[PDB]
């Protein structure tokens, strides 16, 4: 017959390969495909939706709704209010939509949107500095050290939300999802720019945060997720 | 691109964001 | 005649004692087995000029260059590199002149 | 092909094509037509076995493992075997897809799981992390066939670092890592057997293909001591009281006398 | 089905074969290819670079920088200063770039460039005869026996270097890398043509040597290198 | 020259000296 | 995938089959092909060269040069001088070039040239009858029974050689190399036609013989040769 | 006539008497 050869990798079952397979049940006509609203073709479109960062994950607030906001007040001196380390393996990001999509992939490359919303009354105003320290830089611990990075300064009035675009600043072309020191993403820090001034002396505001992906965000090397375990058998 | 089994189910793997992220009117 | 292991570099310490070792060489005896004249191998010339490198005779046909201490090696002043040339010459007489480049290290 | 020999007669020139200068850092343009009187020779010789795709694309052994209790684990690196490591350290940056052939003497049913970086590998056979939804896995029987799969260029850069003169952490850190250890990890391969019958020896033969070599380096003239480390002072005896001596392990042989060879 | 046959050499894993293999991780987009300077496509281009011959490999000078030069002086009679046997398995050539490339290949065919440089002061002059004895000829041990071969005579002044092109003189079409008596390459010998005359009586010069490949040099039969060992396990 | 796996990485082996040996100005 | 079948004779290693095999050492450039004089493309061209028949293989002359000639004399009555049985397995033919080529093949078909040369002085003359008895006929033992077959009659003078073309007379299309009674080739017999008359009374002549193949000679069924043995191991 | 290995050495078997039997001038 026709001379053939079976090189290495012929009688192997790779799971992630693409092969054709003999149709069991031939002549089977499937049920018809109707227009169901909301069809998703790419899981990055799930990753691009704003999803709340659990910015108050401390050991009392986890398991409660009050882990999604921090409480701000009128202070005299500028304090660092909140630090989000730009890691997709950190539990701040990895429990969101963006992070639980990006935790399936070993690498990621793109820009992050982080949108802060202050829930307070209509008379509380305030200015906050939201700074992104690029990779290789220390966590600032001073506003003069934080304003030297990628920052925005947002006022409070008539709209509660403001978005900092954490840009893609990296040496390599892709950043690792499980954060190491070689490809660390940097830090996002929230500061008081001028204060938070409520209409009373002991008044408060509640700052939330959401994160999503920019359109230029890409992922590769699909892997297992560390955001799923199985220790017992599901029966 | 050959279909070795003459069936549509027997093939291999086959091939807009704005319904999410902006579902406004 | 040949001088075994001479095109070579020796090394002496800075404040070396009179009698220290600075290179060990040999001589192959030209396939006639005519031995070396007992005044030889000598040092005819040095590169800047130099005493205190005297060639000694170890046990056998193996020789050695030894600082006799008539001149002190002082690296903080000069000179720090010498090029002595060693002159083996046998009983019938077929000479071989070969260079030993001697450096001086810095003891500090 | 190589250039043919051109004919050259007697020449009395005033620009010498054989007096050059080593100091300029450029090699000579000197052909045999400069020194002697040559004839025409049709040279059909090629160097097609000397290009990087044929020099490196040969399927060298990268790592050996032994199944202890139906389980082996190998992190993908060209660093355990010195003969492929020397050929890779001819160059500084290498961009290559690699195909991975597994030669095991086990008889039965084996599983390879290419664990990508950033997740926990299965720590044993019968572990729960062998049941994975997205980790690419290869089942095969070693009788009737060797398994083979191409891992593409997973680099985080335009090329792999064969040498890295840097550190992964800043100056004040203490667990700093010199070399190419943090710059790239090619995942790992986790081996297990679902049968018990045959042997335990698993050999991993990796062939670099679509190779692009970027900065040439001197070939190594000393034996390797560690991996990811580029050291060459071999410390042979740790126990006895000649411990702090360090062999060199180079390949420069000696001749008894110059101008007699 | 279609009649096929599996002849001998089908279910075999040859290492040096060229086959296609199923891509694990499909859909993987590699990182982009940038212009990195210095791209090398052929290891002969490494072999064609001038690299220093360790011409003083004697049992004291190996392990030191002073194995790369020999020392010359003012002599009365002509002496053979240096012999390089034209072997790619000899430790003179095999530790260079040309030799450590050619030691990977069982055969080689072409011309060698050997460039001698004399490091001395600007007043030392000298003429040297650099002779290549072709294969089959004895090592000369007289300048009258050495000048009958492929030689050059180089003066010393205003440029320290001179290249002898060791031409391709051989019976066969390829010469073996591990030198035997059937395909020996001959010898290169350096002689005093008139002297070496320095500006003092005991003055010296330091002759180095580099070797490279000519453009018409070819190699074949890629093999293991004898310039690499592994006796311990790298952990 | 057929690509049996429809991938660029899945293929076989693919196919000037003067940047060295004369890197002058 | 594409439906194939592996019929009988697929996973078999036949030695005499024609298959392609994977080139070990790829990229190997062989040494160039020069014009070497005398290129032989067909071993029948070796078989068509005149080669001496050992016509005196008796138990004293084998191992000596004197087995290649017989000695003739002046006789009164006609004697049968020499018989060559037309067998390629007979040691007369099988040690020649024609016979040691044809002993590799189980069948042969064609015509034989047999050339007799008489080495004697320039005054010895003689006429000989060289008869070929066709297959099925007895060996003649009389010149009147031998002249009824394919014969030639050659005189001796000014040229010592004469060729009898043993023609292809056979029932079948091919004759067996190992001679049997079914496909025997017949006999060639040398007779005195008139005498051999030397210039002295006891003078002699020395008749040699060579054999070759005609252009219409063919062979088939390549087999082992019985003209080669191996009883010890070559070390 | 296909060359399945893309090499000249990898192929199968390839395909005047008067230099002998009449080497005269
Ligand atoms: Ca001092
Ligand atoms: Ca000092």
Q: Transcribe C23-46 into DSSP letters.
A: EEEEEE-TTTT--B-TT-SEE---
Give the method used: cryo-EM
Facing residue for E2 by CB, picked from G4, G24, G32 = G4
β partners of residue E176: E107
How far is Cα G179 from Cα G184, in angstroms, rounded to an integer?
6
Q: Token digits for G174?
A: 């091919």
Facing residue for G20 by CB, picked from H10, H17, H19 = H10
A203 in Cβ contact with A83 (< 8 Å): no
How far lies G31's CA from each of D44, E136, E217, E218, G34, in Å?
9, 22, 14, 11, 9
Tokens 């003209």, residue located: G227
Tokens 């938070």, residue located: A196
D109 in Cβ contact with D142 (< 8 Å): no
Rounded to 5 degrees, φ, ψ at A107 are -125, 155
Q: Count CB pairs under 8 A between chains E and F.
A: 37
Nearest alpha carbon to residue E15 among D209, D57, G28? D57
Nearest chain A residue to E1 by CA: give it.
A1
Mark out the alpha helices in H1-25 (DSSP H runs).
none
Q: Count CB pairs under 8 A between chains D and E.
A: 273
**How many CB atoms lie under 10 A from the CB of residue A233?**
6
Cβ-Cβ contacts under 8 Å, B2 against chain G? 2
Q: Token digits for E116?
A: 């001698």
Is E60 near chain C, with CB under 8 Å?
Answer: yes
Indicate the number of domains in chain G: 1
> Pairing relation of β-strands E70-72 and E51-52?
unpaired
D198 in Cβ contact with D106 (< 8 Å): yes
Tokens 């040092």, residue located: C43
Q: Do D251 and E224 touch (CB under 8 A)?
A: no
Is E203 near chain C, with CB under 8 Å?
Answer: yes
Ligand lying closest to the C-alpha of residue C106: 2
Rounded to 5 degrees, φ, ψ at C80 are -110, -10
Measure in Å the smallest separation between the Cα of C34 and chain E Cα atoms. 20
Q: Within 13 Å of residue E215, how many CA atoms lie on the same side as its CB?
A: 16
- Ordered by start, the domain boundaries in chain C are 1-108
Nearest chain E residue to F21 by CA: give it.
E49
E44 in Cβ contact with E101 (< 8 Å): yes
A53 in Cβ contact with A209 (< 8 Å): yes
Facing residue for A1 by CB, picked from G1, G7, G19 = G7
Sign of CA dihedral H7, H10, H15, H16: positive
Q: Within 13 Å of residue E64, how many CA atoms lie on the same side as its CB?
A: 14
Q: Give the resolution in Å.
A: 3.2
How far is Cα E147 from Cα E135, in angstroms, rounded to an integer?
15
Facing residue for G27 by CB, picked from D42, D45, D48 = D48
G92 in Cβ contact with G85 (< 8 Å): yes
Chains in contact with chain H (at least 3 beta-carbon pairs closer than 8 A): G
DSSP 8-state code for residue D22 = G
Q: Residue A117 is part of a domain; what is its CATH number?
A: 2.60.120.20
Is E22 near chain G, with CB under 8 Å?
Answer: no
Nearest alpha carbon to residue D154 among A107, E94, A152, G65? A107
A1 in Cβ contact with E3 (< 8 Å): yes
Rounded to 5 degrees, φ, ψ at G94 are -70, -15
Facing residue for B17 by CB, picked from A20, A37, A45 = A45
Measure in Å the smallest separation between the Cα of C35 and chain E Cα atoms. 21
Cβ-Cβ contacts under 8 Å, E64 against chain C? 9
| E181 Cβ contact partners less than 8 Å away, ≥ 6 residues apart | none
Could you check whether the bond before residue D153 is cis, i.e. omega within 30 degrees of 0? no
Instruction: Find the angle CA(D32)-CA(D38)-CA(D39) to the nearest 5 degrees.
Output: 135
Q: Which domain range does residue A101 map to?
A: 1-235
G223 in Cβ contact with G106 (< 8 Å): yes
Instruction: Find the angle CA(A50)-CA(A56)-CA(A57) to the nearest 5 degrees.
Output: 100
β partners of residue E151: E131
Measure in Å the smallest separation between the Cα of A28 and chain G Cα atoms. 21
How far lies G233's CA from each of D158, D165, G229, in Å?
60, 61, 11
G85 in Cβ contact with G178 (< 8 Å): no
How far is Cα D21 from Cα F14, in angstroms, rounded to an integer?
38
Nearest alpha carbon to residue A2 among G20, E18, E13, E20? G20
Note the CATH architecture for domain D1-261: Sandwich (2.60)
CA D252 distance to own-chain centroid: 22
DSSP 8-state code for residue G93 = H
The DSSP H or E segment spanning G100 is helix G97-102
E-assigned strand segments in G39-186: 51-52, 70-72, 80-85, 105-109, 112-119, 125-133, 150-155, 161-166, 175-176
Ligand lying closest to the C-alpha of residue C72: 1
Helices (H) and strands (E) in chain H, counts: 0, 0
Cβ-Cβ contacts under 8 Å, G4 against chain B? none
Chains in contact with chain G (at least 3 beta-carbon pairs closer than 8 A): A, B, D, E, H
Is C5 near chain E, with CB under 8 Å?
Answer: yes
Cα of B18 vs centre of ligand 1, distance in Å, is 82
C102 in Cβ contact with C7 (< 8 Å): no
Nearest alpha carbon to residue E134 among E146, E122, E121? E146
Is A1 near chain G, with CB under 8 Å?
Answer: yes
E108 in Cβ contact with E219 (< 8 Å): yes
Q: Token digits for G213?
A: 């193949």
The DSSP H or E segment spanning D71 is strand D71-75
Q: Do chains B and A touch (3 or more CB pairs under 8 A)?
A: yes
Is E170 near chain G, with CB under 8 Å?
Answer: no
CA D56 distance to own-chain centroid: 8
Q: Which of D102, D156, D180, D188 to mutate to test the interface with A (most CBs of A within 10 A)?
A: D156
Cα of C105 vs centre of ligand 2, distance in Å, is 8
Cβ-Cβ contacts under 8 Å, G20 against chain E? 7
Q: Do A172 and D144 touch (CB under 8 A)?
A: no
Nearest chain B residue to A30 by CA: give it.
B9
Chain B residues near any Cβ of chain A (below 8 Å): 3-5, 7, 9-13, 17, 19-21
Is A18 near chain E, with CB under 8 Å?
Answer: yes
How far is Cα C98 from Cα C87, in angstroms, rounded to an integer?
7
How far is Cα E227 from Cα E43, in angstroms, rounded to an integer?
16
């Amino acid at each position: 017959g026709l001379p053939t050869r079976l090189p290495s990798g012929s009688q192997q079952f790779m799971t992630t390969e693409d092969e054709q397979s003999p149709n069991i049940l031939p002549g089977f006509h499937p049920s018809k495909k109707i227009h169901i609203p909301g069809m998703i073709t790419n899981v990055m479109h799930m990753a691009r939706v704003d999803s709340f960062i659990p910015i108050n994950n401390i050991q009392g607030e986890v398991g409660k709704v009050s882990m999604y906001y921090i409480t701000v007040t009128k202070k005299t001196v500028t304090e660092r209010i909140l630090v989000l380390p730009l890691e997709m393996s950190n539990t701040l990001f990895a429990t969101t939509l963006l992070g639980e999509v990006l935790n399936y992939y070993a690498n990621w490359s793109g820009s992050i949107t982080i949108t802060f919303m202050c829930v307070c009354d209509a008379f509380s105003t305030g200015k906050f500095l939201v700074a992104y320290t690029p990779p290789g830089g220390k966590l600032p611990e001073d506003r003069k050290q934080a304003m030297l990075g990628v920052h925005i300064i947002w006022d409070l009035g008539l709209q509660s939300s403001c978005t900092i675009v954490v840009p893609w600043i990296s040496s390599g072309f892709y950043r690792r999802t499980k954060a190491d020191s070689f490809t660390h993403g940097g830090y996002v820090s929230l500061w008081y720019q001028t204060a938070f001034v409520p209409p009373v002396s002991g008044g408060t505001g509640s700052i939330l945060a959401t994160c999503s992906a920019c359109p230029d965000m890409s992922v590769r090397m699909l892997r297992d997720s560390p955001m799923m375990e199985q220790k017992n058998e599901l029966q | 691109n050959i279909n070795y089994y003459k069936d549509s189910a027997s093939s291999g793997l086959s091939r807009d964001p704005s319904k999410f992220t902006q579902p406004l009117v | 005649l040949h001088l075994i292991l001479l095109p070579a570099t020796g090394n002496v310490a800075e404040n070396s004692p009179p009698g220290t070792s600075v290179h060990k060489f040999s001589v192959k005896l030209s396939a006639s087995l005519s031995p070396v004249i007992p005044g030889f191998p000598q040092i005819v010339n040095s590169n800047p000029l130099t005493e205190a490198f005297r060639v000694n005779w170890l046990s056998g046909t193996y020789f050695e260059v030894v600082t006799t201490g008539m001149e002190q090696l002082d690296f903080e002043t000069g000179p720090n590199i010498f090029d002595l040339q060693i002159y083996v010459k046998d009983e019938v007489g077929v000479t071989d002149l070969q260079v030993l480049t001697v450096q001086v290290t810095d003891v500090n | 092909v190589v250039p043919d020999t051109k004919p050259s007669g007697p020449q009395h020139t005033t620009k010498p094509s054989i007096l050059g200068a080593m100091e300029i850092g450029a090699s000579s343009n000197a052909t045999p037509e400069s020194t002697i009187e040559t004839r025409y020779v049709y040279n059909t010789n090629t160097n097609a076995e000397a290009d990087v795709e044929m020099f490196l694309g040969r399927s060298a052994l990268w790592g050996k493992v032994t199944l202890t209790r139906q389980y082996a684990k190998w992190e993908i690196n060209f660093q355990e075997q010195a003969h492929i490591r020397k050929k890779f350290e001819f160059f500084t940056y290498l961009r290559f897809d690699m195909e991975v052939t597994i030669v095991t003497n086990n008889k039965g049913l084996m599983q390879i799981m290419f664990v990508p970086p950033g997740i926990d590998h299965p720590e044993t056979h019968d572990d729960r992390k062998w049941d994975s939804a997205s980790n690419p896995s290869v089942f095969f029987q070693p009788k009737s066939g060797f398994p083979r799969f191409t891992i593409p260029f997973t680099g985080l850069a335009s090329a792999y670092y064969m040498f890295y003169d840097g550190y992964d952490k800043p100056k004040g850190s203490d667990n700093n890592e010199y070399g190419i250890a943090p710059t790239n990890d090619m995942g790992l391969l986790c081996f297990r057997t679902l049968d018990n019958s045959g042997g335990n020896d698993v050999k991993i033969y990796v062939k670099p293909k679509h190779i692009t070599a970027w900065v040439p380096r001197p070939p190594r003239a000393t034996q390797y001591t560690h991996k990811y480390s580029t050291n060459y002072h071999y410390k042979p005896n740790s126990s006895g009281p000649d411990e702090h001596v360090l062999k060199d392990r180079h390949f420069i042989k000696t001749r008894p006398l110059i101008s007699s060879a």
